Design a protein around this nucleic acid. Structure first.
Lengths: 98, 56, 159, 168
RNA sequence: GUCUACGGCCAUACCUAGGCGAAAACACCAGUUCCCGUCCGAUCACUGCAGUUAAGCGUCUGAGGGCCUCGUUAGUACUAUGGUUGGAGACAACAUGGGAAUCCGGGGUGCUGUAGGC
RNA sequence: UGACAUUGUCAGGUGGGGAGUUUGGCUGGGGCGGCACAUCUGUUAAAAGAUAACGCAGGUGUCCUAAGGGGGACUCAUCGAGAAUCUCGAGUAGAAUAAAAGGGUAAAAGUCCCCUUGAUUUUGAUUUUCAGUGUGAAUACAAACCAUGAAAGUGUGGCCUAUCGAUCCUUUGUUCCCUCGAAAUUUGAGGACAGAGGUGCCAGAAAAGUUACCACAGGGAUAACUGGCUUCAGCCAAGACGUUGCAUUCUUCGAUGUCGGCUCUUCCUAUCAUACCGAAUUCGGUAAGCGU
RNA sequence: CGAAACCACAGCCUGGGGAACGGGCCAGGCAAAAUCAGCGGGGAAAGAAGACCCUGUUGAGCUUGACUCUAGUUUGACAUU
RNA sequence: UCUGCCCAGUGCUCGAAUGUCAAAGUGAAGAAAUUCAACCAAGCGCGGGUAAACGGCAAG
RNA sequence: GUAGAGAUUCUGACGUGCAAAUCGAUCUUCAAAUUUGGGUAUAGGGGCGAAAGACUAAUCGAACCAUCUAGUAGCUGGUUCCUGCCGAAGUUUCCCUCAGGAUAGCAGAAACUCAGAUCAGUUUUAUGAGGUAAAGCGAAUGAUUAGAGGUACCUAUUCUCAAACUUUAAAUAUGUAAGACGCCCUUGUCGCUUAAUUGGACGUGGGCCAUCGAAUGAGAGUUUCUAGUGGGCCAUUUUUGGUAAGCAGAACUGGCGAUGCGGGAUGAACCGAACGUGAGGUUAAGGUGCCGGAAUGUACGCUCAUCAGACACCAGAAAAGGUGUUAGUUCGAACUAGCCCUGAAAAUGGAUGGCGCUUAAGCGUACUACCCAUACCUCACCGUCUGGGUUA
RNA sequence: UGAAAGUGAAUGCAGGUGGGAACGCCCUGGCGUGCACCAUCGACCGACCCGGAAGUUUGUCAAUGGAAGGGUUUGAGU
């Protein structure tokens, strides 16, 4: 799928409440913080005798992910998230069909 | 597994009962623009009836 | 095994009539539907927007909501051992007035009329429809209509 | 699979209409299925006997059962009163045609009956009606069949085809 | 009655050959300054009426193709209910009800609403 | 020998020597197959709806910044005619419309062109599968903001019918937001809200074999094993050709002793021999008495 | 002198139907006390909650490259120093 | 009386690229919890040997 | 080769034995890796093993004892008095679910309201919807027969078909309406809507007023909590997979499961009929020679069978035949129809239920009389429910 | 009521409409009146989405504060 790097769409910002130019970016999952409560609880439970104490997921089936667009408002830097359908080939701002 | 022989007999045991019909239905399911209008019209109608009763 | 799509097994139901394909008649959009009106649902295959389910094709119901280009129709659907109210938003392309309700309204107008002249004349008026009565006694004349005697025909070989 | 029967018209299939007035039908009396293989065998038997007795040019045999239903092979689904075979001949070959169809009854399952048709040959008109219309000129032969006058169509389009027709 | 504009049902209105059309209207038509668009004003856009009914258009004819109705097919095919009915079965008949389709033949070849023009 | 090593605690690695667990479900018994496990079109299906099989013929886990939205102009598949590809006659769609199949479509939903991001934000209300729970898909509105068009109007993705995902955790977006509870500041964390990461066994456990040494609770809901049921001769004339006849899982798994031989008995005739006739050592009829 | 196994009740056949091989049901053949010695056709004779097969979100012995760990073992670091 | 060929795989065994890397320590940033960077043994990767090792007929 | 030590064969005896491993005969070994007493050590995920998963006190693929422990159980078995009233389900959805649960339905109690209403497994009148049976191919598409014409075609024909083909299109099932929440007139409100009090929606105040707008019949509806069930099976008709099946899988209705009773000789679902205790009468299906209650009835016929025929489901049979016979149809002949016979061919003795039956006690048709169910009718009594009375 | 900090239920006779128990009244019905209950239309309280008036002091411009009004969404509310 081809998505233009810039689109004019409604901006839900407090100061905009209208259509504004948005830079489109693919949402990437950030690093996993070791200080998160789930990580802290997991570490304490995993420490000590008893083996592995939480399910480990081996049965991966889907080969594609839903792509999420993060829209940077040019005016007020407001960011909005849009999710599209699953696509094997994804690209941002490519050449137009001719 | 699966058959439909007894289900119709089981259905009519206590009849195919219709839902109760009430005089007024909910103004839900209606157009929001229409629904809010009818509030204002009904509010004025209530006021008009009360004033007419008071003055008569 | 089945496939349970919304338009499954609708090949002949949603098909346009023979030599009735093409542009939809314009009179459909010029009819006004009000709440309480009786309407017959008949899905038009040309307009794929606002289509009701294939259950509601051929069903008759009462309009409860009127929208910009659509109509809200109240249908009672059999679900197990009860009737459920089903509120279908169907575009006016798939909706037509029920001639039964018209005919009832004209009969109501006639009955009120007959009642008016009955009271004016001081007589009582018969307003309730009656099932077809048994045939009355009547004479049948044989003048120039002499009965012809018939006998069953013998068997013949005609393929 | 290919049907065992391929030829459905035998004898003088190119013959006209007026010279073969008599028509005799072998009709199934029972609702049954007839195999293509049995139809072929009866066709061979009927053709062999008719050629041996009356010759090749004294008859026209037409098999009206077509094995289109599939069961490995094909069978011809027949109903009560459905014609299986039809032989058109002269009036003298009535006994020969009846015997030919009677012998071929043994090749068919179920019950089959021999009926002499009241229609002229393979036409849809009775013998008396065909004779009257032939005399009046509304019937003109065309190969193995004949074209009949009809009210529809242009007057010139029917007059050129039927020149001697005497319209009232 | 005829014509135009806007329509309703959307072939009784369609397709084809031939013969007519007085008035007005309509159309064909002349031109490319401009508004406008194309390879090309041929289409579309604009200005006008010098000729024309050749065509469009209206109408008539054809046992025309088609289409629409009425009858024939036909109480036929089929089907709901019934029998300790027939028949080895296939299937069939009967009793009480409903009841088509093609072929074929007769008739028909648009009607009509509002606003106007002749 | 010697401040090494040996011991002590922790950190890598190694560790079937040993430990505890597991080793899908459906299924004409199970196993091997296949997915009928989530799903769409035409059928099975018997003219409302609903309706099964490891029934049948096919699909789906995608593709697309246009193949999405609006407006304008245009007509397609073919066939005939004739010029060193374009020209006009016909042309009811016989072409195209992303992908399976069906439905839908002609001044268009088709092919080009121009402008576009309604594939956006926020509600509730409906429809389908349904328990009228969830998920998914869809319909008609409403409050904004816009695209487009002269305008009416149309647009909340693909002309319609499929193309998908909970709790927990993690992660991102959002608020001049709430809390860290003796009081503050700054980091950090925990919330609310909207998404995503993924569970295809698709209402979503973290899971290799083997037993002929084998063990339990059961099962005739379920196999082997026994019972039942089910699968040569006569017609036609050239004896060919035809034609008509003579797996299932119901019982038993708190047990019906499992092949052959030996022994012994009896019945059937579809007759090997014997008896009796009949047809040219060869073939039939009556015939199961006796033998084999 | 003196047990036991076994025992619903029982004890002649043929056919029918029936959970598809009846001692009982239905229709027949029939039918005379009490017994002794043999006998192995039947009682689908006894013995035992099939030991084969399958089911169970029941086990177990064995295996390995299953899942999660482990005695031991190798190496590092600190301490003893 | 003979015990053939094969180190490809797996197993075992003795030498190396600097490829890895935990705990400690080291270096910088911070007000700190800490965050980055470098380094580290063994085990493995890489190279040699070995079949009267498991085995196969890399070898046929 | 004996004592001693073993334990090959008879697969001998015995096999509720002398014996929870013995007895007989035969057989192996018998101066050493020999046989053995006592002392002594090794103990249960351990010992010990010239190796059989052998042995470790009749216990060994993990001994024995007591505990945790009344371990757990979607599996098996049992679950104790009477009568009265009501009375199922084997189906939907989800589940590592398929021998089980949750869920909706069926079902029971307890209530509450409503009322000549608000309704119906029905018809009628009015009006929708559908693409199955049939029908069609000289209509599209697809398959197919045969000539004739006009030049492999084209034209008019013609033979024959369709589950995924179709112009057309039933029967049966199917949606709704058939009014007082009605009708007519007047009139008010609104921020919606319109060019506009114009509409729209809800109203006001009046007016017509149970023949109140089809037939028939019934009183009606809703809440609450909970049990059992979540293996089904048979028949009619329609039908799928299958060579077939007392086969597998569906659709509508009725039955069985849960249900006796009369008839089918007998049988879970076939035919009749559904059941409190009795008396009388009359019937259904089926029957009346005897068994067996009831005509060895009436009328007209057919049939002679060397193993006839005898009543649906049903206990099974075919083509073709006959110097069988009784009739019919058409030109002596060919036929067409009934009955009988042939085709027809198994195993304990044996089944129209048995006996028997031949101008039938067989077969077809008509006609009376008769027999009897727990069914119907009148009556008595028992119980339940329902309604009307009861301060003397 | 909200996750919390926190806020915290009368325009009205504690509100209209329809059906209603019981009673009254009038000549079988009619008129008034409406308990309980459900259909329903609105008001109030809280959360959410807006909206920023007083007041408070502390940064006055700001900080803090949050009334009026707007949703026709939400709660196991009045």
């Amino acid at each position: 799928v081809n998505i233009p790097k810039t689109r004019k769409t409604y901006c839900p910002g407090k100061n905009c409440r209208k259509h504004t130019v948005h830079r489109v970016t693919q949402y990437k999952k950030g690093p996993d913080s070791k200080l998160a409560q789930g990580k802290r609880r997991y570490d304490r439970k995993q420490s000590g005798f008893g083996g592995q104490t939480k399910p480990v997921f081996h049965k991966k089936a889907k080969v594609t992910k839903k792509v999420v667009l993060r829209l940077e408002c040019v005016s007020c830097k407001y960011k909005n998230q849009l999710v599209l359908k699953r696509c094997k080939h994804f690209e941002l701002g490519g050449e137009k069909k001719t | 597994n699966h058959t439909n022989h007894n289900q119709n007999k089981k259905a009519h045991r206590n009849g195919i009962k219709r839902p109760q019909k009430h005089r007024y239905d909910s103004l839900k399911y209606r157009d929001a623009k229409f629904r809010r209008n009818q509030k204002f019209a009904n509010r004025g109608t209530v006021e008009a009836i009360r004033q007419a009763k008071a003055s008569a | 095994p089945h496939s349970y799509g919304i338009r499954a097994r609708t090949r002949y139901t949603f098909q346009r009539g023979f030599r009735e394909h093409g542009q939809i008649r314009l009179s459909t959009y010029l009819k006004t539907y009000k709440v309480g009106d009786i309407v017959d649902i008949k899905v038009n295959g040309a307009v794929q927007k606002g289509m009701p389910h294939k259950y509601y094709h051929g069903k008759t119901g009462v309009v409860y909501n009127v929208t910009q280009s659509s109509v809200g129709v109240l249908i009672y659907k059999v679900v197990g051992n009860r009737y459920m109210e089903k509120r279908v938003n169907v575009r006016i392309e798939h909706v037509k007035h029920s001639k039964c309700r018209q005919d009832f309204l004209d009969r109501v107008k006639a009955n009120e009329a007959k009642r008016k002249e009955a009271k004016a004349q001081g007589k009582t008026v018969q307003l309730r429809r009656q099932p077809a009565p048994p045939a009355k006694a009547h004479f049948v004349s044989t003048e120039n209509n002499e009965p012809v005697t018939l006998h069953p025909v013998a068997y013949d070989t005609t393929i | 699979p290919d049907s065992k029967i391929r030829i459905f018209d035998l004898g003088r299939k190119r013959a006209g209409v007026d010279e073969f007035p008599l028509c005799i039908h072998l009709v199934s009396n029972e609702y049954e299925q007839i195999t293509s293989e049995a139809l072929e065998a009866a066709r061979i038997c009927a053709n062999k006997y008719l050629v041996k007795i009356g010759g090749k040019d004294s008859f026209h045999l037409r098999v009206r059962a077509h094995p289109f239903h599939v069961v490995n092979g094909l069978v011809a689904r027949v109903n009560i009163g459905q014609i299986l075979m039809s032989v058109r001949t002269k009036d003298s070959s009535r006994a020969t045609a009846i015997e030919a169809l009677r012998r071929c009854q043994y090749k068919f399952p179920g019950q089959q009956r021999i009926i002499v048709s009241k229609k002229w040959g393979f036409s849809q008109y009775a013998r008396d009606e065909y004779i009257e219309k032939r005399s009046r000129g509304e019937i003109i032969p065309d190969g193995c069949y004949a074209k009949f006058l009809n009210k529809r169509g242009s007057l010139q389009e029917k007059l050129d085809l039927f020149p001697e027709a005497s319209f009232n």
